[PDB]
């Protein structure tokens, strides 16, 4: 993922990008969505706006990190792509990592609205006019937000250990799955059990 | 390039009902949002109401409540704008246009084509073509204007041509005006040099499509 | 219900000049305002949305500005395909009301209205209705008044005026008014006349004809 040279944003907040293969983690969530160019910077702790306040809120003590690469060749078609919506009205802000898909018509005023648009009563959602002929910052941006965690349960998912070639009949410093020391490695005429 | 094919002209009667359809050319609907706009003849635009096809929500402007009913058919991708209790002043050109699934912001980017709806109380009537002779051939000695008046026909349109389309220079066709009785009337004149007078013959041919009539009136001077 | 108001009403100019259209509102609209262009006998099309964003495919000569309660659409290089009626719509809240309009015309040298009059024909006299037509041809500008004086008496309440669109060759207008009246009323008068008053006319030209003998 890191040395892909095909991404735009790979900022990692809680942990170092190069220490990912070292730390061992319990469970890994992975969120995904598509947003505008000028709103990728809003996917960060302590940010505000119409897409971070009540569309996708990241906790301040965030530990995973955010990946976002421009794709103006799959989600943008002539005449626009009206399959990508976003909420811009809500009663109140979002606590971190919350999902809201209800489509109750938002009421800005004190007037009862009764499920139909009217004066000071807006529809909650809004679409993206994803035109292929748009400047950068209005083009779609696919986003993935990895989010690591440390649970009291034992760690299950983490990176590959880099093995090396074995050497026989010399004095070296061995290490196999945790056991470590020094000595001479040689074949032995013994029998073990598969466990 | 979404296209919004619309219905055809529908002449009606006062107190009746009308159903204008705005079909999306390309298949079915999406998160469009469709709003209905009408334009009175020779006036500004007016906004009536909007519909959310896929999310099922629609109502009209406060003035039009209780009279307009907008429905959508996602199976075929066609929106309906049934309008009951038609009034004499409800005649206009009715448009449909997608405006983005929202309530504020983008605007009406793709429009339909217009569904002229005439609401009156008069049956189809043929045109009564009369000629306007080149009277008073003393204006400037070299210029003269003559035409043939079309009166008491219904409904639009009528296409006036001169010499079976062989003449277009200096030819005018005024817009039809609705009279007190309820029938339309328009003129059509051509400016002709005085030299051509008395030697060349001109005939205006009208073509009222609803009453499939073809008339040929040959204009003449003032009976000598 | 926000009420918009455009100004001026006609805003006549010449090709290659700069236009300035205002759409002052009644209340505060933050930045939501769309400008539509409607050529005669066609469907309006979007030009400017969000009061500063040019729609796709629109030539760059269209620029919009303003915010709050006073916007402005400005055209830099006028071209023959830029003469139409321009509407502004406030997309703030219910309902999305439109504006008046601004028929951007074309300017030219003033012209003299040719005047002709046609008496009702004998064939048209078979029934009980006779109509007299006074015609104004190839004048400029739009403003022109026609007055009917039957037997030197002012006639009102029975005339209908019709104006064509601006010509695509010489940019001159054309007007026609009909004096519809019953045969008996025609039979009860002698001399008919149509009076024209124009800015480009030094004196009010009057054309007339006496009944029957012609």
Numbering used by the authors:
A (entry chain A): 368 to 562
B (entry chain D): 1 to 224
C (entry chain E): 1 to 214
Sentences from the paper on this structure:
SARS-CoV-2 enters host cells through the binding of the receptor binding domain (RBD) of its surface trimeric spike (S) protein to the cellular angiotensin-converting enzyme-2 (ACE-2) receptor. After the ACE2 binding, the S protein is cleaved into S1 and S2 subunits by host cellular proteases including the transmembrane protease serine 2 (TMPRSS2) to promote fusion of viral and cellular membranes for viral entry. Moreover, B8 proved to be the most potent HuNAb, capable of inhibiting authentic ancestral SARS-CoV-2 with an IC50 value of 0.013 µg/ml and an IC90 value of 0.032 µg/ml, respectively. To understand the potential mechanism of action of B8 HuNAb, we performed a cryo-EM single-particle analysis of B8 Fab bound to the SARS-CoV-2 spike ectodomain trimer.
Two B8-spike complex structures were determined based on 351,095 and 616,799 particles collected, respectively. One structure at 2.67 Å resolution contained the spike with all three RBDs adopting the “up” conformation (3u), where each “up” RBD was bound by one B8 Fab. (A) Side and top views of the Spike-B8 3u cryo-EM map showing 3 up RBDs each bound with a B8 Fab. After superimposing the “3u” and “2u1d” spikes, a ∼53-degree rotation was observed between the “up” RBD (red color) in the 3u spike trimer and the “down” RBD (gray) in the 2u1d spike trimer. Cryo-EM analysis further indicated that B8 is a typical class II HuNAb that binds to the SRAS-CoV-2 spike RBD in either a 3u or a 2u1d mode.
